[PDB]
Amino acid sequence: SMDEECVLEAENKKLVEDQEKLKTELRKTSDALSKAQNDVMEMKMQSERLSKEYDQLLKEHSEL
């Protein structure tokens, strides 16, 4: 026989479940930002090699 206790339990359960979801979303967010961090580092190194290649190219070929 359903009573108000029944509904109370449902509401509390919902509060807890949404806390869990916010936790999950936080983790997905940090994961994405860590991917971005790695990508930025990749760009840093790639850019340093590229800059060395530019330097080298202009040094060997004075007409450029």
Least distance to a copy of itself, CB of residue 2, Å: 15
Is there binding between residue 53 and a copy of itself (CB under 8 A)? yes
Q: Give the x-and-dash track for 5-44 against a copy of itself (CB under 8 A).
A: x-xx--xx-xxx-xx-xxx-xx-xxx-xxxxxx-xxxxxx
Is the Cα dihedral 55, 57, 62, 64 positive or negative? Answer: negative
Calculate the dihedral angle through the C-alpha atoms of 50, 54, 55, 56, rounding to the nearest 10 degrees.
100
Asked if residues 35 and 29 have their Cβ atoms less than 8 Å apart, the reply is no
Q: Which residues bind a copy of itself (CB under 8 A)?
A: 5, 7-8, 11-12, 14-16, 18-19, 21-23, 25-26, 28-30, 32-37, 39-44, 46-47, 49-51, 53-54, 56-58, 60-64
